[PDB]
DNA sequence: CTACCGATAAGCAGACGATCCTCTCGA
DNA sequence: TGCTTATCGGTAG
RNA sequence: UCGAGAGGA
């Protein structure tokens, strides 16, 4: 059964944070995937047996980061990657605000 | 995974600063003047093998009174066993590499004792030289001053080539006996 | 920008514990001791970690500390003890 | 001197057909309508294109339109939002996750 | 060569282990992780010092579970090499290619280019030696090494160094 | 997770940065060459040819290979190839920016039309914004089009000081489809008369200007310096979706299947080898252009298919092509479709019936629902024996468990598992069990119009297949029980079971904040009664008053 | 359109309705602060009727044999009888009352006096009188001194927005004021014996009790407030359906949903224009 | 009287339009 | 519901 | 799977 705008929103309203959470990420999509501290983009080339985490074009195998993010976020940062936009993805904060 | 302490900021790849050498060209970490949990501005901290065996030691005997509190509810040859002892005590099998440091650092101590290495550090931390440079001059036994400028090139232009040899006939009499 | 951190005295925030509150402290709780943790009330037969969750507050033995945050970003680390339980 | 005839225009519609809406959501939705200097529009142009970060606004009809645009200026979401946590699958800051939680090691001791 | 570093490290505990038991489990568990393991960045983690005194500050919860974040900050003592260094050890492994010295955790490499051509290696001679006129170079023998180079390699630091050089050698 | 125990740290994205990918970037990060147009098999033969689709990336059927990292398709989000452009080639978003910008800075020199000097140009600086600041720099470069060398007067006594390099007149440029065409004046008392003279503007002319661009420049017109450069504006290099984005799918065995975007990008890679000999061989000048324009089409509608004023591009048969635009387009397209609404598991939906002997919280579940759901209870010492019950009584008898999760990630399947009879139950294992009486479970109507239409309600398995409710809890929801259908999610944690229990409750959300008085009340067959009861007229005998005084669930007993 | 404008609206823990970005909305939620549904329609006797009955009502005059209270009332009537200081506070308690007249009226200008405030004062009596179990024949436990000073220091005990600063604690009275009024109009010296007859036992009860509803009834920060606002009003609009409103003569004027699209889309478009001249 | 500064019109496309759910029929 | 682009006529240089 | 139609509260 589809959790649509309609059914996001109430949610909302109510004050439900982990809930709406629970719905759109482990109870649907929710992807394991690792992301790169330097280029901020999925560049990296993970491998969970011989430990070989380096990613090409930074070289390094220490600032990486894995992250729990939807398959249709991933999939949407893959689409805008093919389109020649960059979403880089920083785990720190550098503004504030 | 640590990597802390000097953090921020990578703006996009970074040609990776520069090579590490003995020219005081150190690490982009490793900077003369650094910050502290405390969150004051330090001096790098840099230890030479006197100083740093009995730094190392320190912690080990006073990890043992901790470990040990909750229970409840000298010498050349006698040092080495001594240590051997303290590390099994203190620490697991799993750390060989502190086993390798433990033995190289007792058997390669310019002084032994406590009591001739404050007056060491008081000696060479106060000439105005880079802490590494004190780091070597404490860990290498220099007898000439070309020997101490060439082991050391940080040197060179920093210090006058007699006012070190004053320094170097200092730590000759201020020397361990083994 | 550096520390922050607004102290346990001088604070502009309320001390009624609000009903988000209330069940954030609840369900992490009782998703602790659904996730074995250990209990500190003495309990009576109680086979729901959320009716557990609930004695833990009457009593106030609960560790949880709260850092409700400001909008410039600063924050308020209000214990468990503190917040009163009115709603 | 705008808000309050423009609360009175949308009161108006209220009161018309029956039921009442507490003054609370009218001042509001008004209040965020004129929090800017004038009158904003509550469409594609007016609110849509405002200060907020590059997914708070693509969310909202002008879709790559606006993803094109936050890439041109290099525009960078602050991910302090309803809809950045919600697309990036992490618990917003909302009702419940509007706080951090932490355990004190004194109460561990305390309560034993 | 020896520092002492400043350094962090985040550690995500389990709630079943949320009781009077856990400060001292926490620094176990980091001890078990930071302590023997080695860093390009920093170097040989050797031991971590002042067990007492270990700021812990505050584990937020995670979303989704009973688990909590703990940014266990700490000091500790790092062995960190460079290209131009000069340290004294003891030779431990011996070849005809070269031989291999030992230098605090770390095993430095020397060639048989690397060091002086009045030398050469004497097979004829258990354990294996590198004769010159009457200094010898056996399984043990302390000598003074200047590091060429430095090598990064897993979690375990490596060098190559040389001993052919005015007031290097052996000592 | 999506599955397996992963070494590096993980951390909530507290930022997100928008940019542009650099074409130096790109063959950087990139896997895989590309240069076969050809997909399936190796040479004509089986599994994937090294030119598109996994030469050294996206696993494709029943295989792990990910460049030798593997994985499989599980695990696997996909790896990044790359393909080098023959000649640049304009982005379809950025033809609007592109075009202005090129409107704004003066070629040839390549400077700002406008300097520090003018009144203006102080005015439109004076914002420190990005888009806006850009807007005003748009309509005063716009006019004046010709560089400059000397221009102070009114500043500097009467002569004038050099700031500019080559004074050149800057052209009239219009959006011709595709391509661009600047209109140089001139004129005067010399050649073509009094008509203008119209020069094509090609992408090697435009990237040439926008090299030459100071830093300072973009920042005038609202551009970074390692983000977004107008020099990747324009496409020299382009990245290559690997499958997970655009898939194989293969159905039967020996079937190709390919997605829309798979075909579009071979076109690209055709429309690409033609100009790759063109420019190579002899060059027969107006015939090359010929080629580039429907290279510059290829790209821009793999884009963007949606799309101009005029070309449209289809994809034989008489059907278009799904472009990246129209993919992640809003309603029902990723964004709408995919991240702000999704279908998700562990739900239910029946037709709807009332009941005056359901509390107002409760909901009447049908028993094949509560069967057909189950919650994860994790093995502790206050379950145990409960749980012990439920896995013995398997997924058949109501009260059961379909899976028991142990210490390591593996589900014990009871519907077919051997040792579904014993199992020893160790501390800390998930039990999928089926849906308990007086569970607080989130009970849904479409449409969701307002904070009610989803409260939780406290389960109550029974049986006939239809979703039973209290008659008073009607107003909420402002459904009928004609046939009208609702849904129903059950929560999979002990936090989001307490977030819905002491939020969304039924009883906490009996006054409506809308309007500051009751959603809920008494209604028909108990509202139509209550009139008939309540007044002088009607009296009840013995015989039924205890009746009446036992129907009550908090009574005294005392009559 | 609604729910995606108010999205980011939310209240924050300084009792403030700012957004994502960090702009202030409302300083203080609906102008008063308080969580909506912890709210009912209550009548106010300061603004409504004559001013000779006001004055009968409320005035307490200790200074007069016929203008004083009645020793049926009070423990004290006989003492409390033309005294100089207990009258000084009775000026100052209809000084006050009289205050609340002229702004009322400066406020709600068309005589209205049931409006939605929090706590409800009229039923709070109600219970007072059942709690205790008190009769009129007998008198109070209870001196002016009491009645006037626990109303006092109850305007005190309100706290909608903690402050220290000159501002949040002018922004605490500005935020009080209507609730405060009807607290003075609920509360009168003369009211409490009068109509009431409640004992010392029974008034501080009602103090307490009356502090405890109203801290009850303000906001709770991270309520989506925006959110709600926009599903409280996108509601009704699905209900409207049904143009004509004579009347008072309005026959081609655009009501409802039409009348709605022109409001949030502004679009200078003309449909009813007719502007009202006095 | 001419050159310039802004005025109003000529010409002129854009992209959005309830939420969820059921089922068949091709090419 | 906007935007875009010429034409216009006017003050002062 | 895509696209078209029909029907529901």
Redesign the interface.
């Known amino acids: 059964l589809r959790f649509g705008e309609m059914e996001r929103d109430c949610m909302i309203a109510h004050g439900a944070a982990s809930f709406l959470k629970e719905r759109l990420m482990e109870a649907s999509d929710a992807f394991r995937v690792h992301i790169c501290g330097i280029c901020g983009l999925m560049t990296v080339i993970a491998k969970l047996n011989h430990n070989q985490f380096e990613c090409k074009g930074c070289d390094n195998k220490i600032d990486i980061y894995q992250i729990h993010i939807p398959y249709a976020a991933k999939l949407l940062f893959q689409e805008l990657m093919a389109m020649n936009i960059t979403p880089r993805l920083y785990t720190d904060r550098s503004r504030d605000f | 995974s640590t990597s802390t302490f000097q953090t921020r900021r990578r703006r996009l790849k970074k040609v990776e600063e520069e090579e590490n050498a003995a020219t005081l060209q150190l690490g982009q970490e490793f900077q003369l003047k650094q910050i502290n949990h405390q969150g004051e501005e330090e001096e790098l901290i840099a230890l030479n093998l006197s100083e740093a065996r009995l730094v190392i030691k320190e912690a080990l005997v006073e990890r043992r009174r901790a470990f040990k509190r909750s229970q409840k509810k000298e010498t050349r040859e006698k040092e080495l066993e001594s240590i051997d002892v303290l590390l099994e005590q203190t620490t697991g099998g799993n750390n060989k590499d502190l086993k390798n440091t433990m033995q190289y650092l007792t058997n390669f101590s310019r002084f032994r004792d406590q009591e001739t290495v404050g007056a060491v550090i008081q000696l060479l931390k106060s000439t105005g030289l880079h802490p590494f440079e004190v780091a070597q001059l404490g860990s290498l036994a220099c007898d000439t001053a070309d020997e101490a400028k060439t082991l050391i090139p940080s040197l060179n232009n920093k210090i006058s080539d007699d006012e070190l040899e004053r320094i170097l006939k200092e730590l000759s009499n201020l020397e361990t006996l083994y | 920008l550096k520390e922050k951190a607004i102290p346990k005295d001088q604070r502009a925030t309320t001390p009624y514990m609000t009903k988000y509150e209330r069940a954030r402290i609840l369900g992490t709780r009782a998703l602790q001791i659904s996730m074995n943790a250990p209990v500190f009330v003495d309990l009576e037969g109680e086979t729901d970690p959320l009716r557990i969750a609930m004695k833990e507050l009457a009593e106030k033995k609960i560790p949880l500390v709260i850092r409700r945050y400001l909008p410039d970003g600063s924050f308020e680390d209000w214990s468990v003890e503190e917040l009163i339980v009115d709603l | 001197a705008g808000r309050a005839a423009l609360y009175k225009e949308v009161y108006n519609v209220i009161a018309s057909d029956g039921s009442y809406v507490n003054y609370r959501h009218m001042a509001l939705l008004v209040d965020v309508m004129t929090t800017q200097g004038g009158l904003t529009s509550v469409t594609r142009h007016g609110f849509n294109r405002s200060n907020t970060g590059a997914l708070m606004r693509c969310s909202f009809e002008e879709t790559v339109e606006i993803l094109f645009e936050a890439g041109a200026s290099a525009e960078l979401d602050d991910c302090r939002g309803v809809s950045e946590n919600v697309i990036l699958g992490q618990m917003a800051p909302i009702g419940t996750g509007a706080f951090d939680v932490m355990i004190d090691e004194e109460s561990l001791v305390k309560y034993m | 060569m020896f520092f002492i570093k400043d350094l962090s490290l985040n550690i995500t505990l389990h709630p079943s282990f949320f009781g009077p038991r856990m400060k001292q489990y926490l620094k176990t568990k980091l001890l078990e992780e930071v302590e023997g393991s080695c860093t390009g960045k920093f170097g040989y983690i050797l031991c971590v010092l002042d067990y007492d005194n270990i700021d812990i500050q505050r584990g937020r919860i995670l979303p989704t579970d009973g688990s909590a974040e703990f940014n266990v900050k700490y000091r500790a003592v790092v062995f960190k090499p460079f290209k131009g260094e000069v340290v004294d050890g003891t030779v431990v492994s011996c070849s005809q290619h070269g031989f291999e010295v030992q230098v605090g955790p770390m095993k430095v490499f020397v060639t048989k280019h690397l060091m002086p051509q009045d030398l050469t290696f004497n097979a004829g001679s258990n354990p294996p030696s590198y004769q010159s006129s009457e200094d010898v170079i056996t399984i043990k023998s302390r000598i003074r090494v200047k590091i060429e180079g430095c090598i990064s390699q897993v979690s375990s630091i490596h060098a190559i160094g040389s001993i052919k050089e005015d007031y290097l050698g052996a000592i | 997770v999506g599955q397996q125990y992963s070494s590096a740290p993980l951390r909530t994205v507290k930022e997100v940065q928008f940019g542009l990918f650099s074409p130096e970037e790109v063959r950087a990060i990139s896997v895989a060459k590309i240069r076969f147009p050809e997909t399936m098999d190796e040479t004509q033969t089986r599994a994937k040819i090294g030119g598109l689709n996994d030469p050294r990336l996206g696993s494709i059927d029943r295989n792990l290979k990910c460049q030798t990292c593997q994985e499989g398709m599980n695990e696997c989000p996909g790896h990044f190839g790359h393909i080098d452009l023959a000649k640049p080639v304009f982005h379809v978003g950025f033809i609007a920016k592109i075009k202005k910008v090129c409107e704004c800075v003066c070629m040839h020199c390549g400077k700002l039309l406008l300097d520090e000097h003018n009144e203006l140009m102080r005015q439109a600086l004076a914002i420190k914004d990005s888009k806006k600041r850009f807007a005003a720099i748009w309509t005063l470069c716009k006019t004046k089009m010709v560089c400059e060398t000397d221009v102070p007067s009114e500043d500097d006594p009467t002569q004038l000081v050099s700031r500019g390099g080559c004074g050149n007149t800057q052209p009239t440029i219009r959006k011709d489809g595709l391509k661009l065409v600047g209109s140089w004046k001139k004129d005067r008392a010399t050649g073509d008369a009094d008509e203008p003279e119209l020069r094509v503007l090609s992408t090697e002319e435009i990237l040439n200007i926008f090299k030459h661009i100071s830093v300072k420049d973009f920042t005038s017109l609202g551009f970074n310096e390692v983000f977004s450069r107008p020099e990747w504006m324009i496409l020299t290099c382009l990245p290559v979706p690997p499958p997970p984005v655009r898939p194989s799918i293969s159905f039967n065995e020996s079937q190709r299947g390919e997605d829309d975007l798979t075909f579009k990008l071979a076109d690209i890679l055709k429309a690409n080898i033609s100009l790759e000999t063109l420019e190579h061989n002899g060059a027969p000048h107006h015939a090359i252009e010929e080629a580039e324009s429907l290279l510059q089409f290829h790209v821009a509608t793999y884009m963007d298919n949606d799309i101009a004023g005029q070309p449209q591009a289809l994809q034989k048969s008489g059907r278009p092509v799904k472009s990246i635009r129209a993919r992640l387009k809003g309603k029902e397209g990723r964004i709408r479709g995919n991240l702000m609404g999704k279908r998700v598991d562990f739900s239910a939906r029946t037709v709807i019936s009332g009941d005056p002997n359901l509390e107002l919280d409760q909901v009447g579940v049908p028993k094949s629902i509560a069967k057909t759901l189950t919650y994860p209870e994790v093995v502790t010492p206050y379950n145990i024996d409960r749980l012990t019950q439920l896995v013995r009584n398997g997924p058949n008898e109501h009260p059961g468990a379909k899976y028991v999760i142990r210490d390591s990630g593996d589900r014990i399947d009871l519907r077919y598992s051997k040792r579904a009879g014993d199992i020893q139950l160790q501390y800390g294992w998930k039990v999928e069990r089926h849906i308990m009486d007086n569970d607080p479970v989130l009970f849904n109507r479409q449409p969701s119009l307002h904070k009610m239409s989803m409260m939780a309600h406290r389960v109550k398995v029974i049986p006939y297949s239809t979703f039973r409710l209290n008659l008073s809890v009607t107003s909420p929801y402002n459904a009928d029980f004609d046939g009208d259908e609702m849904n129903l999610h059950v929560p999979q944690s002990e936090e989001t079971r307490a977030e819905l229990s002491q939020l969304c409750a039924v009883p906490l959300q009996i006054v409506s904040p809308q309007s500051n008085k009751p959603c809920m009340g008494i209604v028909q067959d108990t509202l139509c009664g209550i009139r008939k009861l309540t007044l002088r007229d009607t009296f009840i005998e013995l015989d039924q008053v205890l009746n009446m005084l036992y129907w009550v669930p908090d009574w005294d007993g005392v009559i | ?10 209240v ?7 957004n ?7 300083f203080i ?3 008063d602060g308080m ?3 912890h ?3 209550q009548s106010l006797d300061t603004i409504g009727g004559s001013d000779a009955a006001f004055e009968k009502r409320y005035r307490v005059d200790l200074l007069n044999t016929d203008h004083t209270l009645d020793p049926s009332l009070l423990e004290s009537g006989s003492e409390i009888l033309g005294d100089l200081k207990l009258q000084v506070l009775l000026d100052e308690e209809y000084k006050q009352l009289v205050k609340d007249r002229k702004f009322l009226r400066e406020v709600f200008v068309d005589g209205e006096a049931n409006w ?1 405030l929090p706590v409800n004062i009229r039923r709070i009596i109600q219970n007072a009188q059942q709690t205790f179990h008190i009769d009129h024949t007998k008198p109070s436990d209870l001196t002016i001194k009491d009645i006037v000073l626990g109303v006092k220091d109850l305007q005190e005990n309100l706290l909608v927005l ?3 600063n000159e501002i ?1 604690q002018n922004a605490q009275r500005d935020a009080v004021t209507l609730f405060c009024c009807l607290l003075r109009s609920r509360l009168a010296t003369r009211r409490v014996l009068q109509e009431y007859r409640l004992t010392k036992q029974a008034f501080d009860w009602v103090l307490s009790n009356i502090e ?1 509803q109203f ?2 009834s ?1 906001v ?17 609009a ?5 143009f004509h ?1 004579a009347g008072v003569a309005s026959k081609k004027v655009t ?2 949903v039409p ?2 699209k022109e ?5 200078k478009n003309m449909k009813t224009p007719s502007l009202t001249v006095y």
């Open positions: 359109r609604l729910v995606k404008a108010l999205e980011d609206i939310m924050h823990y300084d009792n403030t309705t700012r994502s970005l960090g702009n202030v909305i409302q939620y609906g102008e969580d909506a549904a709210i009912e329609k939605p903690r402050g220290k949040i405890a801290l009850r303000v709770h920060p991270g309520e989506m407030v925006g959110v709600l606002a926009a599903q409280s009003i996108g509601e009704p699905t209900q409207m359906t049904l409103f009501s409802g009348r709605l409001i949030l889309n502004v679009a």
